[PDB]
Amino acid sequence: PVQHVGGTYTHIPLSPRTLNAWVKLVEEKKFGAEVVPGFQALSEGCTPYDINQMLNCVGDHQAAMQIIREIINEEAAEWDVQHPIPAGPLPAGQLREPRGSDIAGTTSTVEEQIQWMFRPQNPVPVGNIYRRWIQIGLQKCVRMY
Amino acid sequence: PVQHVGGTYTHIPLSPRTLNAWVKLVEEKKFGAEVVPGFQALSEGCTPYDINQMLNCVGDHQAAMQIIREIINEEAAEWDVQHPIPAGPLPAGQLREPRGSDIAGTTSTVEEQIQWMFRPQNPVPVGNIYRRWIQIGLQKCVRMY
């Protein structure tokens, strides 16, 4: 999550209580139907950095990471297909529009993620887009497990 | 739940995201299959006070609340019958053994609940015994809804 203190938006991590709650939620029936709303509530206000921490937390469930990974690449490829990258201009020292991999938090830092989410000039809610990609992945975990 | 810092055992509330997760879980299929797994998992480590915080969140489902009330009542009564307590509640100074409603958090404080759970000479798992009564209620709500 993110918090504003003196014209400065800053990262605050998910508390251990919450990460711990999510792990429990997941291990309870092993991707039971409950993980989907559970995840939507526990990831409210999150940056991609924070969602990747949530997933790292259950990473010993390799079979679900793989289902989730597959959809992330599926949705990130689609994203790139629907967000070309325009032929400049873009000024050295100025932050790129995000690609499907910046949204997933693979090629971007938490700080860049906060800059897209809260910039006044067409923010891009990268954390909320990513959550949509994970949800679909979670829904598949539930149907294939 | 309970944090152990400084040889003194202290209440740590459920994180707000945990509580919202509970609600989403409940309101997802209106007391659907998930609430029981969801309950078990998110209620881990709680005092009855916390279990009651969870319940106050979904308090506007009076119908399920009522089903839960019957159960707590059935169970709190059999607790009292199976722990006679002699004529006539003397008492003393040292904290009373829990009655059916100290377990339900009605006639007790979190400090008192933490006191039963952690005292070294015969602890009493009040949070968990109470979890057990809320699951039977929830199991009933799923059957009844």
Numbering used by the authors:
A (entry chain A), B (entry chain B): 2 to 146
Passage from the reporting paper:
In a previous study comparison of the crystal structure of the N terminal capsid domain of HIV-2 with HIV-1 indicated that the HIV-2 CypA binding loop is shorter by a single alanine residue at the position equivalent to HIV-1 CA88. Furthermore, Mafa TRIMCyp2 restricted the HIV-2 mutant with an extra alanine, whereas the wild type virus remained unrestricted. HIV-2 can be made insensitive to these charge changes by introducing A88 into the capsid, resulting in susceptibility to Mafa TRIMCyp2. This suggests that the two viruses normally utilise different binding mechanisms but that insertion of A88 confers an HIV-1 like binding mode. The introduction of A88 increases the structural dynamics of the HIV-2 CypA-binding loop and allows it to adopt alternative conformations. Importantly, this allows the main-chain nitrogen of the introduced A88 to adopt an orientation that in HIV-1 permits hydrogen bond interaction with cyclophilin residues G72 and H54. These hydrogen bond interactions are not affected by the E143K mutation, explaining why HIV-2 with an inserted A88 is no longer affected by the charge change. Position CA88 is therefore a critical determinant of sensitivity even to mutations that are over 20 Å away as in the E143K Mafa TRIMCyp2 allele.
Certain monkeys have modified their TRIM5 genes by swapping the virus binding B30.2 domain with a cyclophilin A domain inserted into the TRIM5 locus by retrotransposition. This leads to expression of a TRIMCyp protein with antiviral activity against viruses, such as HIV-1, that recruit cyclophilins. Using a structure/function approach we can show the molecular details of how adaptive changes in the TRIMCyp sequence switch specificity between members of different primate lentiviral lineages.
